[PDB]
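Blackboard transcription, Thursday session:
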Amino acid sequence: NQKLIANQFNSAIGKIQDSLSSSALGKLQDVVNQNAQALNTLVKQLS
Amino acid sequence: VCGPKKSTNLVKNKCVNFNFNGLTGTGVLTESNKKFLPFQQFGRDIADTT
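(Written on the board underneath:)
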């Protein structure tokens, strides 16, 4: 079934791009948002 | 009613102590591209620093 298996793999890889061009990286965006919020609170405590 | 208030002349592009009308600080003065409204005196940023 080699040709069928290669075709299924190629279309499954092609759907990852179309899912990512729409997000799904929330676990990496949370870390950035938390560190920026903590530095902003530290700086606003000087007033 | 009070006395007069003296003024020196401003120097750009080097580290000074400044005093603009009761707002003191220390830093480097440089010409800007910001445009205020004609009643505003100074600007701040997100963290409320001048």
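Lecturer's comment: DSSP finds two helices and no strands in chain A.
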